[PDB]
Amino acid sequence: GMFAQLVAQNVLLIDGPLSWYSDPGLAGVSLTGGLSYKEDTKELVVAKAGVYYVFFQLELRRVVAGEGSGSVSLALHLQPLAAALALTVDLPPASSEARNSAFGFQGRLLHLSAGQRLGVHLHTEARARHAWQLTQGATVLGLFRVTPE
Amino acid sequence: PCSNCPAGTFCDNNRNQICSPCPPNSFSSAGGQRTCDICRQCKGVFRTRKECSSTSNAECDCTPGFHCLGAGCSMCEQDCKQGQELTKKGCKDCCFGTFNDQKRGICRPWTNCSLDGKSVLVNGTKERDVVCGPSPAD
Numbered sequence: 174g175m176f177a178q179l180v181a182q183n184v185l186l187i188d189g190p191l192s193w194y195s196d197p198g199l200a201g202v203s204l205t206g207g208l209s210y211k212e213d214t215k216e217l218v219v220a221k222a223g224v225y226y227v228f229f230q231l232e233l234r235r236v237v238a239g240e241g242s243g244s245v246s247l248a249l250h251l252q253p254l255a256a257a258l259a260l261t262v263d264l265p266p267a268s269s270e271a272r273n274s275a276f277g278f279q280g281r282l283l284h285l286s287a288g289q290r291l292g293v294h295l296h297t298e299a300r301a302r303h304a305w306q307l308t309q310g311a312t313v314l315g316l317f318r319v320t321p322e
Numbered sequence: 323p324c325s326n327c328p329a330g331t332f333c334d335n336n337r338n339q340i341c342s343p344c345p346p347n348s349f350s351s352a353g354g355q356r357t358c359d360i361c362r363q364c365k366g367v368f369r370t371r372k373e374c375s376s377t378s379n380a381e382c383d384c385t386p387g388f389h390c391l392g393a394g395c396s397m398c399e400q401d402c403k404q405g406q407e408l409t410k411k412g413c414k415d416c417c418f419g420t421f422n423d424q425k426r427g428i429c430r431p432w433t434n435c436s437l438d439g440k441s442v443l444v445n446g447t448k449e450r451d452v453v454c455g456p457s458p459a460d
């Protein structure tokens with residue numbers, strides 16, 4: 174069939190594109206025929222055009238007690254064609270109650286071209302850029318086909 | 323069938339069920355796992371204690387000047403200030419009747435002037451200790 178799932182390689186919060194684990198045999202990643210991950214520009218390629226369901230996952234944990242706040246935004250940019258997918262996760266400030274976790278999910282049908290490159294750019298505006306990191310293995314860019322073949 | 327291969331390896335259901343070494347960053351600690359789990363990266367406040375090995379997962383300490391908080395070092399709390407004692411999941415503010423002056427110091431009871439025959443010139447707080455002295459004898 175046609176589908177894929179990639180786990181984000183990044184951990185800290187830094188602007189710019191995200192690296193991914195494309196190797197089957199890793200915990201939650203799946204890569205089938207017709208889809209390859211380019212380790213140079215960090216963008217996976219869809220060979221066969223069609224309509225695909227692309228879903229988005231962002232989970233963050235607070236690694237420093239008492240600090241951190243603001244928003245962490247994620248965007249899926251289509252290379253050969255401004256933001257096809259948008260997910261903005263908010264980080265709670267340190268309070269009497271303990272909120273150490275933040276999560277968001279985004280998905281919708283997308284029409285992809287032949288050889289369309291897909292990549293995810295992370296842009297976070299926060300008070301303390303540290304004290305908040307990506308949960309390892311919990312950030313995922315998935316894809317699976319809809320259009321029949 | 324895929325069960326006979328030991329820790330540090332998996333079997334892919336592609337490549338016909340054979341057992342293969344783990345990908346460059348990954349680990350398998352038990353049995354017949356179908357996948358090598360991702361190694362924990364220690365970055366930011368975290369320092370790597372045990373490096374990533376195929377048999378054992380990585381362990382993270384925190385940065386000098388910090389300390390671990392939580393089960394698996396989920397958080398990092400800054401080393402508490404004066405008048406504070408680490409409560410093992412949280413830092414209390416000293417305790418009522420005790421004092422600590424130090425970065426890492428443990429909150430300890432005040433000095434007792436009744437046992438020294440003197441009286442309190444300055445009562446104690448969380449940050450500082452009672453200093454004894456003679457009573458208002460003049």
Ligand SMILES: *[C@@H]1O[C@H](CO)[C@@H](O)[C@H](O)[C@H]1NC(C)=O
Nearest residue numbers: 418419441442444445446447
């Ligand atoms: C010092 O402070 C404690 C805390 O309130 C109080 O109970 C105690 O009476 C004070 N010392 C004296 C001599 O009053």
